[PDB]
Design a protein around this motif. Structure first.
Motif, PDB file in Angstrom:
ATOM      1  N   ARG A  25      -7.024 -24.438  -2.379  1.00  0.00           N
ATOM      2  CA  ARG A  25      -8.476 -24.350  -2.338  1.00  0.00           C
ATOM      3  C   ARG A  25      -9.139 -25.636  -2.806  1.00  0.00           C
ATOM      4  O   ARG A  25     -10.216 -25.988  -2.311  1.00  0.00           O
ATOM      5  N   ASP A  42     -10.961  -1.802  -6.982  1.00  0.00           N
ATOM      6  CA  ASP A  42     -10.621  -0.398  -7.158  1.00  0.00           C
ATOM      7  C   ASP A  42      -9.831  -0.142  -8.436  1.00  0.00           C
ATOM      8  O   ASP A  42      -9.658   1.022  -8.814  1.00  0.00           O
ATOM      9  N   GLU A 102      -8.312 -29.513  -0.004  1.00  0.00           N
ATOM     10  CA  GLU A 102      -8.793 -29.941   1.313  1.00  0.00           C
ATOM     11  C   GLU A 102      -9.565 -31.256   1.298  1.00  0.00           C
ATOM     12  O   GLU A 102      -9.267 -32.124   2.135  1.00  0.00           O
ATOM     13  N   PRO A 103     -10.558 -31.470   0.423  1.00  0.00           N
ATOM     14  CA  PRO A 103     -11.381 -32.687   0.559  1.00  0.00           C
ATOM     15  C   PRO A 103     -10.594 -33.977   0.438  1.00  0.00           C
ATOM     16  O   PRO A 103     -10.921 -34.970   1.101  1.00  0.00           O
ATOM     17  N   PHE A 104      -9.552 -33.985  -0.383  1.00  0.00           N
ATOM     18  CA  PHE A 104      -8.920 -35.219  -0.824  1.00  0.00           C
ATOM     19  C   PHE A 104      -7.864 -35.687   0.169  1.00  0.00           C
ATOM     20  O   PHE A 104      -6.879 -34.987   0.417  1.00  0.00           O
ATOM     21  N   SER A 105      -8.081 -36.875   0.738  1.00  0.00           N
ATOM     22  CA  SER A 105      -7.012 -37.556   1.458  1.00  0.00           C
ATOM     23  C   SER A 105      -5.997 -38.156   0.499  1.00  0.00           C
ATOM     24  O   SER A 105      -4.805 -38.226   0.820  1.00  0.00           O
ATOM     25  N   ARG A 106      -6.453 -38.599  -0.670  1.00  0.00           N
ATOM     26  CA  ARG A 106      -5.570 -39.045  -1.738  1.00  0.00           C
ATOM     27  C   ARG A 106      -6.311 -38.861  -3.050  1.00  0.00           C
ATOM     28  O   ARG A 106      -7.356 -39.481  -3.265  1.00  0.00           O
ATOM     29  N   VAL A 107      -5.772 -38.016  -3.922  1.00  0.00           N
ATOM     30  CA  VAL A 107      -6.412 -37.700  -5.192  1.00  0.00           C
ATOM     31  C   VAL A 107      -5.399 -37.902  -6.307  1.00  0.00           C
ATOM     32  O   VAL A 107      -4.195 -37.695  -6.119  1.00  0.00           O
ATOM     33  N   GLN A 108      -5.890 -38.336  -7.461  1.00  0.00           N
ATOM     34  CA  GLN A 108      -5.030 -38.489  -8.621  1.00  0.00           C
ATOM     35  C   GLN A 108      -4.693 -37.140  -9.254  1.00  0.00           C
ATOM     36  O   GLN A 108      -5.556 -36.269  -9.450  1.00  0.00           O
ATOM     37  N   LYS A 167      -1.357  -2.242  -6.970  1.00  0.00           N
ATOM     38  CA  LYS A 167      -2.770  -2.264  -6.607  1.00  0.00           C
ATOM     39  C   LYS A 167      -3.369  -3.652  -6.793  1.00  0.00           C
ATOM     40  O   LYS A 167      -4.129  -4.125  -5.940  1.00  0.00           O
ATOM     41  N   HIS A 195      -6.483 -35.802 -12.231  1.00  0.00           N
ATOM     42  CA  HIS A 195      -7.750 -35.175 -11.870  1.00  0.00           C
ATOM     43  C   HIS A 195      -7.526 -33.767 -11.339  1.00  0.00           C
ATOM     44  O   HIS A 195      -8.282 -32.844 -11.669  1.00  0.00           O
ATOM     45  N   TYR A 238       2.040   1.719  -3.391  1.00  0.00           N
ATOM     46  CA  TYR A 238       0.967   2.359  -4.145  1.00  0.00           C
ATOM     47  C   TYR A 238       0.968   3.863  -3.927  1.00  0.00           C
ATOM     48  O   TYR A 238       0.833   4.639  -4.881  1.00  0.00           O
ATOM     49  N   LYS A 284       0.826  -1.202   0.000  1.00  0.00           N
ATOM     50  CA  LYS A 284       0.000   0.000   0.000  1.00  0.00           C
ATOM     51  C   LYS A 284       0.863   1.256   0.000  1.00  0.00           C
ATOM     52  O   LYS A 284       0.542   2.243  -0.674  1.00  0.00           O
TER      53      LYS A 284
END
Ligand SMILES: Nc1ncnc2c1ncn2[C@@H]1O[C@H](COP(=O)(O)OP(=O)(O)O)[C@@H](O)[C@H]1O
Ligand SMILES: Nc1ncnc2c1ncn2[C@@H]1O[C@H](COP(=O)(O)OP(=O)(O)O)[C@@H](O)[C@H]1O
Lengths: 159, 261, 444, 68, 176
Positions: free
Chosen positions: A126, A55, A129-135, A47, A138, A18, A15
């Protein structure tokens, strides 16, 4: 402008950078065109780095911004709208559409790459979080990217 | 703070100029009640109002009574008591009293006498030159005393609005002034009735004849009239008060004020 | 304001009606000019009543001789000459307000805007603002509802609302401008004005058609974008009014709407508190919404909306009154949007109730219970977890989920020791009980 | 500048007039005047706010023309 | 504080009309206080005897107190000007407190002209500090309005040297 540059490189707060960039542009008000262009570009970059592109529309709709409007300014506005959409793909699209206009290594390419990494990390965290193990293919499908780059980013994050 | 909210039932004890009381309340209460709307929309609430009628209807009485709908603590501060020494550092005393109001946030500062004897003697122009006006400008720039946050107003109960530093009547200044003069015949008979209220004797309700002799008598003078009627009855050691006692009291006070003026 | 110097009451009394006769049709302006000179004399003498009477007579002459333009420039000159007496100009504006409302005409809009320009020089809270408010309302009525005058009445209200309101007139003015705002279909500004005005309550205990009207204008504003909890809150706030004015149709339809909305609201502790407070109402039992709430509130039942649309969906087709129901779901576009909102709402409700019951549930069964496919079910599961409502970990390659936090061995052995101590206390209590009952039973 | 351009102060506010006072106005008073932009009727700050900030808590000292 | 004055009304005179007037205004509210109570008129308290010295204000006041047979408290006005901050204010406060605690008293404050200036401010002095004490007395005047007791009697020579603030219906009113 130099104080804003130093603070933007310091990255503890943007800031004040800025504020300094706006003061530099106000000094460059239709007096020195290239320095004014650089000052407004740095002001809008910090900004958007503030993660507040709302803004940005008002700032670019300001009278002086329209007076000094240009292709680089429009590219920065597109970058701001990409930040709005939270689309790292859109940010990369804007960077490619105006590459040479924003290829500058000093506090242009560096900060754009830093912001791109920020969006990559935010998207991954983001969606993770849901995935304990995800490919990972994917994950790449959700992020709308290839496999190697997504894997490299996730690695560099976890190392 | 010396005077507080309880005892605020004088809304019926004022009697005269009830429309004037209503107008002052309309001007004062709403910013005093919910000042947050003023900040919310970006408008400055008024600071207070000016009152005329040097010896007439009770300006201090109105100050007490109007705070009924306000639930605030009226403060009777004297201009001389606020200015003390003749230096611009007199603002220290105003700072202390405004801090007192801030502590007792629902407060209304009732000023005693700013235009010292507006009917005669020395006015703002004579004697102390501009000292009063600068001290008032101090409270004027106080207006940024968090009007949105602070439930504090200031009523200026001057005697005569003649010498009141017209620089202090611009917008942003005291602004509003409500006209109070000697009570009319209707207000006079009404205040006579309310004065006689506590008095329960034989007498009569022949208030208009009393008004005829006692026209142009201030509310305080009429309270003194009722007290003089009681004094006459007790000096006679009579437990009855008749209209002749009222006639004697009215004649006595009329002759007294006629000789004193 | 300033002390009177030289009165001209006799002069005005002896001359003004003669002047009116001399210019009965207003063809003469020398009469207007000489009364201007007389009122200037009385103004320099600082007399208010004479000046006010002169101005009232001038505008009355303009009324009777119907010269609309000459009226416009005449009142402009009167208001702009030196400002004159504030009392007198406030009067003249008041009689102008009384006059402009009786003649329809085409250029009465011009008259209204002229007086608005004369009064907008300031002096709003001081020296009459109700005239300006009434003129703006009259402009609204003349233009028959549009966006420009709605914005005008939006930007006018605040000064007088803050300064000198009326517990009925001012709030009715606010209600008559917010409805125009919503007709304009501006949402940010209408929300702003509604939230800035609704802080002024504690008059609605004596409302006739005021609180309900406010609430039924702000219903659309809230429900337009995303509101569903404030919706139920102020629908019950309109429900409690037929309690004091028991009218069956509105009462029952308000009950239906509030019962539907409070369930439709997204899950939260406050929504739970509202639904438990709503349940058990003695007057709520005679409607099918009673059964709907009893089924869909508690006991973690499988809210298969495909079954619900016929088990408790009769409010869509035909009920007791079915008017709030047709407003909510019987609509086409917003109705289908609220249908989708019921669909997802029940999906998250099923997910939440499954969270506290099933540790690991297979992907096919979970998708079938959510009435969606694997990808849609996992997308909604992600939508919950990003909101932190549920503690869920999923293996996507295996497609298997878990809801129990990994138990740290410290607190695992701690709860084991607490179980041990509970058993020890049970041993003590059972020992005392059985020994004493043994004593009572061998007392023979 | 601390408060970024006095929290987006307007251009027509420049301190050239309210700073060349020769009226002491210690740095504490300067900070108090800067924070006296707390007039939140608007989102920006005007020269009126600075004028009021300088007007409050001040002593009149002037008259350099005789010495110069 | 004199516990009880013994000076009699008969040994003073000359101003018999004024003395009877202030007797009716003060002593009668003491003996026949119930008379005023049932009438409904609260008696005034502030009586200001203005006149050149030797006119018997002190003797009249003490005789009135004796007739009331109530407590009498004398205040030495000219020496109420103390350098100590708020010292006069504290003295007046506790004087009123003592009068309230001891019967319907007679507060006989002398040198009211010394106590209150006519606000004729000048460069030499302007009655800055003593105004605190004057305001303290003013605020103490209203303490005893209910149960109208403890009367205030102020003695001076020239009434005109006082501002029109002490003169009020509930404040000093009976200027004799
Ligand atoms: N209209 C009134 N009704 C009742 N009492 C009144 C009225 N006007 C004056 N008084 C009496 O006068 C006393 C003081 O009035 P005050 O405020 O001094 O009036 P002013 O300031 O005009 O001289 C009060 O005790 C009050 O009882
Ligand atoms: N009417 C009187 N009868 C007897 N002695 C009087 C009378 N008037 C005054 N005096 C004498 O005057 C003295 C009191 O003086 P002082 O009280 O100072 O006068 P003032 O009250 O006018 O200032 C007493 O000693 C008393 O002897």
């Amino acid at each position: 402008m130099q104080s804003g540059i130093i603070h933007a490189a310091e990255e503890k707060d943007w800031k004040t950078a800025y504020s300094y960039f706006y003061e530099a542009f106000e000094g460059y008000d239709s007096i020195d065109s290239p320095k004014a262009i650089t000052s407004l570009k740095y002001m809008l970059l910090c900004k958007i780095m503030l993660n507040t592109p709302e803004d940005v529309q008002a700032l670019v709709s300001g009278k002086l911004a329209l007076r000094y409007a240009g292709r680089q300014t429009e590219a920065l506005k597109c970058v701001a709208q990409a930040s709005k959409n939270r689309s790292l793909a859109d940010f990369e699209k804007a960077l490619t559409d105006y590459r040479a206009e924003l290829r500058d290594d000093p506090i242009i390419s560096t900060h754009l790459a830093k912001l791109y990494d920020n969006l990559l990390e935010q998207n991954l965290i983001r969606v993770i979080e849901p995935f304990s193990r995800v490919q990972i293919e994917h994950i790449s499908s959700l992020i709308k990217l290839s496999k190697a780059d997504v894997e490299r980013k996730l690695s560099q994050m976890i190392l | 703070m010396s005077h507080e909210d309880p005892g605020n039932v004088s809304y019926s004890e004022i009697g005269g100029l009830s429309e004037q009381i209503r107008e002052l309340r309309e001007v004062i209460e709403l910013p005093l009640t919910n000042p947050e709307l003023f900040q919310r929309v970006g408008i400055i609430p008024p600071k207070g109002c000016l009152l005329y009628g040097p010896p007439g209807t009770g300006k201090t009485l109105l100050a007490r009574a109007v705070a009924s709908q306000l639930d605030c603590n009226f403060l009777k501060v004297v201009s001389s008591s606020i200015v003390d020494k003749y230096i611009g550092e007199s603002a220290r005393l105003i700072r202390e009293m405004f801090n007192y109001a801030r502590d007792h946030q629902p407060c209304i500062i009732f000023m005693d006498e700013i235009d010292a004897i507006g009917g005669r003697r020395f006015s703002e122009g004579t004697s102390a030159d501009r000292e009063i006006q600068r001290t008032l400008m101090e409270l004027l720039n106080q207006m940024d005393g968090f009007d949105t946050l602070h439930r504090v107003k200031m009523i200026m109960a001057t005697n005569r609005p003649d010498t009141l530093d017209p620089a202090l009547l611009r917008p942003g200044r005291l602004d509003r002034k409500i006209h109070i003069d000697l009570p009319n015949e209707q207000a006079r008979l009404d205040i006579l009735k309310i004065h006689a209220g506590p008095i329960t004797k034989h007498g009569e309700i022949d208030y208009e004849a009393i008004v005829k002799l006692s026209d142009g008598f201030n509310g305080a003078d009429l309270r003194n009239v009722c007290t003089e009627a009681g004094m006459f009855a007790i000096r006679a050691d009579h437990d009855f008060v008749v209209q002749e006692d009222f006639m004697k009291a009215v004649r006595k006070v009329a002759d007294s004020k006629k000789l004193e003026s | 304001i300033v002390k009177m110097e030289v009165d001209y009451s006799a002069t005005v009394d002896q001359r003004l009606p003669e002047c009116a006769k001399l210019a009965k049709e207003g063809r003469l302006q020398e009469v207007i000019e000489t009364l201007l000179s007389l009122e200037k004399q009385t103004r320099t003498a600082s007399d208010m009543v004479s000046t006010s009477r002169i101005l009232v007579a001038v505008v009355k002459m303009c009324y009777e001789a119907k010269e609309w333009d000459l009226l416009n420039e005449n009142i402009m000159l009167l208001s702009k000459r030196r400002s004159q007496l504030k009392q007198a100009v406030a009067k003249m504006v008041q009689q102008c307000c009384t006059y402009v409302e009786e003649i329809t005409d085409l250029p009465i809009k011009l008259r209204l805007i002229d007086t608005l320009r004369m009064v907008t020089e300031g002096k709003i809270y001081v020296e009459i603002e109700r005239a300006r408010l009434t003129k703006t309302l009259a402009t609204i009525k003349e233009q028959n509802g549009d966006v420009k005058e709605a914005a005008s009445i939006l930007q006018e209200l605040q000064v007088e609302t803050y300064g000198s309101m009326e517990k009925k007139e001012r709030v009715e003015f606010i209600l008559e401008q917010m409805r125009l705002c919503l007709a304009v279909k501006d949402y940010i500004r209408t929300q702003i004005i509604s939230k800035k005005i609704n802080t002024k309550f504690f008059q609605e205990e004596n409302t006739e058609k005021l609180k309900l009207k406010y609430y039924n204008l702000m219903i659309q504003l809230d429900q337009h974008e995303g509101s569903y909890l404030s919706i139920c809150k102020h629908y019950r706030a309109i429900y409690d009014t037929p309690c004091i004015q028991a009218e069956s149709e509105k009462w029952q339809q308000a009950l239906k709407s509030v019962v539907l909305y409070v369930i439709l609201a997204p899950f939260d502790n406050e929504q739970s508190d509202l639904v438990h407070r709503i349940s058990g109402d003695k007057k709520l039992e005679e409607i099918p919404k009673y059964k709907d709430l009893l089924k869909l509130f508690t006991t973690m039942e499988l809210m298969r909306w495909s079954t619900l649309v016929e088990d408790y969906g009769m409010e869509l087709r035909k009920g007791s009154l079915e008017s709030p129901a047709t407003d909510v779901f019987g609509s086409t576009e917003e109705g289908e949007k609220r249908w989708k909102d019921l669909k997802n709402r029940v999906v998250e409700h099923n997910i939440r109730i499954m969270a506290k019951y099933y540790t690991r549930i297979t992907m096919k069964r979970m998708a079938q219970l959510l009435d969606l496919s694997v990808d849609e079910s996992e997308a909604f599961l992600s939508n919950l977890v990003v909101n932190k409502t549920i503690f869920a970990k999923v293996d996507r390659l295996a497609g298997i989920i878990n809801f129990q936090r990994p138990k740290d061995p410290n607190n695992l052995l701690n709860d084991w020791s607490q179980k041990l101590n509970s058993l020890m206390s049970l041993v003590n209590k059972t020992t005392h009980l059985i020994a004493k009952e043994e004593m009572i039973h061998n007392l023979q | 500048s601390k408060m970024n351009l006095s929290e987006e102060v307007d251009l027509e506010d420049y301190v050239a007039r309210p700073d060349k006072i020769s009226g002491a106005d210690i740095n504490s008073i300067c900070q108090e005047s800067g924070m006296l932009a707390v007039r939140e009727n608007r989102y920006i700050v005007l020269a009126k706010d600075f004028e009021k900030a300088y007007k409050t808590v001040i002593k009149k000292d002037e008259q350099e023309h005789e010495f110069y | 504080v004199d516990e009880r004055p013994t000076e009699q009304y008969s040994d003073i005179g000359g101003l018999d009309k004024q003395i009877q007037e202030l007797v009716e205004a003060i002593v009668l509210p003491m003996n026949h206080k119930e008379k005023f109570e049932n009438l409904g008129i609260q008696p005034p308290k502030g009586v200001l005897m203005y006149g050149p010295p030797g006119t018997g204000k002190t003797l009249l006041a003490r005789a009135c107190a004796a007739q009331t047979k109530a407590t009498f408290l004398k205040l030495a006005g000219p020496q109420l000007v103390q350098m100590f901050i708020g010292d006069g204010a504290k003295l007046v406060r506790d004087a009123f407190a003592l009068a309230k605690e001891k019967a319907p008293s007679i507060i006989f404050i002398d040198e009211l002209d010394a106590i209150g200036t006519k606000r004729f401010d000048s460069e030499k002095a302007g009655d800055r500090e003593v105004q605190r004490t004057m305001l303290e007395l003013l605020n103490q005047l209203d303490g005893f309005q209910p149960n109208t007791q403890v009367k205030v009697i102020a003695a001076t020579n020239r009434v005109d040297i006082l501002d029109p603030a002490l003169l009020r219906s509930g404040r000093l009113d009976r200027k004799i």
